[PDB]
Design a protein around this ligand. Structure first.
Ligand code: ZN
Length: 199
């Protein structure tokens, strides 16, 4: 929670979301920038800078089949990042934004402790709320998992409305619990993600 770090984050918008926004690229950009700006505030306490490497919009076609089965979609998306995106756009992590309603109550998915990893530094997000704060918290929860964070034990940790709560609160805080901070310190210490510490 203290050395100065930076994550070059690439966002990807699928066909369904592109259509949901009436195929308006300017509208979509403004929407995601608002969310990313809140994500920047969420990570500020950890001295982790979030920079967008780009927002890729699949205006003509989906480069993977976006399936309601989140698990499958995350796997497909992570692989596509590995084999296709990274050959064109260097980035530390990519996050898919889709209007596809995942089965069940899942509105986001990511691999845990994989930040910087060529095959698994990825996450997926269902565009489930129009409120900037709620979507930024959703995006930050997935990036937090990528950064080695587990879910908050709502009783044990010093916060029950923070980023890593297992379920998104109806009215969330931008704050990380003490537990989340300790997990991030452990990730840095034990996992040593070189890509966020570079120059
Ligand atoms: Zn989670």
């Amino acid at each position: 929670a203290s050395p100065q770090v930076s994550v070059t984050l690439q966002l990807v918008v699928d066909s369904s979301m592109f259509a949901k926004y009436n195929g308006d690229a300017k509208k979509i950009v403004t929407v995601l920038d608002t969310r990313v700006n809140i994500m920047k505030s969420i990570f500020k306490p950890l001295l982790l800078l979030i920079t967008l490497s780009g927002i890729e919009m699949w205006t003509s076609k989906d480069l993977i089949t976006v399936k309601p089965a989140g698990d499958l979609t995350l796997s497909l998306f992570a692989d596509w990042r590995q084999t296709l995106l990274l050959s064109r756009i260097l980035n530390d992590n990519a996050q898919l934004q889709t209007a596809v309603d995942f089965r069940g109550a899942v509105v986001g998915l990511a691999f845990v402790g994989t930040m910087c990893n060529a095959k698994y530094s990825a996450g997926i997000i269902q565009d489930f709320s129009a409120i900037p704060l709620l979507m930024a918290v959703v995006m930050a929860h997935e990036l937090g998992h990528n950064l080695g964070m587990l879910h908050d034990d709502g009783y044990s940790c010093d916060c029950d409305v923070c980023i890593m709560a297992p379920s998104l609160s109806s009215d969330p805080t931008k704050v990380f619990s003490n537990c989340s901070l300790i997990l991030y310190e452990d990730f840095l210490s034990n996992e040593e993600p070189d890509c966020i510490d570079n120059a």
